[PDB]
């Protein structure tokens, strides 16, 4: 149940590896600011359960790293895939892919959805 899972992620090969490793009176001051730290956690649980239904529709529920059968298009920021893991932060992706993340999420819908009927036959 993570909402942060930060661990100061900068370099992507260190970000991918550590991701598998890490996330595997005076009573008025402390009761108001204790409920605020329960609304942090209880939302960060319901953000997980909303997210693991979205990966479950794509087929990647539970697995942190998952691989899937949708290749790149040409207009999806064609840089070399060896330097992409060398010198880039994970923050620089959402700058680099702007409007493609909505159609990637749509193509990963139909890649599972056609597969559910393919193994049905």
């Amino acid at each position: 149940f993570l909402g942060f899972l930060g661990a100061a992620g900068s370099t992507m090969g260190a970000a991918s590896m550590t991701l598998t490793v890490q996330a595997r009176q005076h009573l008025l001051k402390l009761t108001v600011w204790g409920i605020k730290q329960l609304q942090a956690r209880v939302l960060a649980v319901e953000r997980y359960l909303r997210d693991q239904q979205l990966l479950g529709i794509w087929g990647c529920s539970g697995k942190l790293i998952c691989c899937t059968n949708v290749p790149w298009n040409s207009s999806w920021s064609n840089r070399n895939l060896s330097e992409i893991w060398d010198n880039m932060t994970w923050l620089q992706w959402d700058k680099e892919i702007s409007n493609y993340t909505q159609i990637i999420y749509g193509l990963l819908e139909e890649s599972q959805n056609q597969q559910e009927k393919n193994e049905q036959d």
Partner: peptide
Amino acid sequence: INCNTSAITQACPKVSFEPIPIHYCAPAGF
């Protein structure tokens, strides 16, 4: 010239007015 200056009257006592520091915090999820 479709504008008109509406006068609004109310009580008006004398107050003390010094500001205290105020910390802006973010809600859960931010």
